[PDB]
Homo-oligomer: A and B are copies of this chain.
């Protein structure tokens, strides 16, 4: 069996837009992806609410710096055949600059980490699939939750695409199959979450 790290934020954890509680496992994208691959791959879910690509954020009960946690994830789960990273939604929070630039820079740093990590064995370098999260939409007040800007979130797909092409990795736009909930303008309902896991099965087969 191939092994896959599914690395992300609360969209990967599976936060309900209304309650903030976790979606049933049957609807979480990493579990869905694994079920879709039907015994080919084992998917290790590592979705942390508030996680950024590479920016400290102490507003939660656990460390939100994606790069530090990615290193731990790589060590815990190596050897890995594929790493999938869906991040950027928190990098466009005002505290982290409010713009897509910080998300693409951080994603480039995570790619370099995956590429150059000291794996056991050294030859076990995983492939990488960079996933753009679905863009934000108008929340109830007319804007997305957390002061995020819609137009900046919409820049993540083309910037991540261009980054993946530069670095020689794969890209998928989760916004092409799923939309943010209008309950908060940011998070995904169960249906949209499961549609991401289903949609990722195809590229994950091309890659593996």
Contact = CB atoms under 8 A, between A and B. Distances in A.
Could you say which of A59, A93, A109 has the most chain B C-beta atoms within 10 Å of its C-beta?
A59
A116 B112 CA distance: 10
Contacts of A108: 59
Interface stretch (A65-73, A132-140, A191-199): A65-73
Interface in A32-82: 44-49, 53-56, 58-63, 65, 67-69, 71-72, 74-79
A101 B75 CA distance: 22
Give this chain's copy count: 6
Given A22-B78, A49-B75, A93-B97, A68 B63 contact: yes
Nearest to A97: B94
Nearest to A118: B61
Contacts of A62: 68, 71-72, 74-75
A20 to B, nearest CB: 6
A105 B97 CA distance: 16
The 10 A-B pairs with the shortest beta carbon distances in the complex, nearest first, are A94-B97, A62-B71, A95-B97, A61-B118, A62-B75, A59-B105, A94-B99, A101-B147, A116-B116, A54-B58
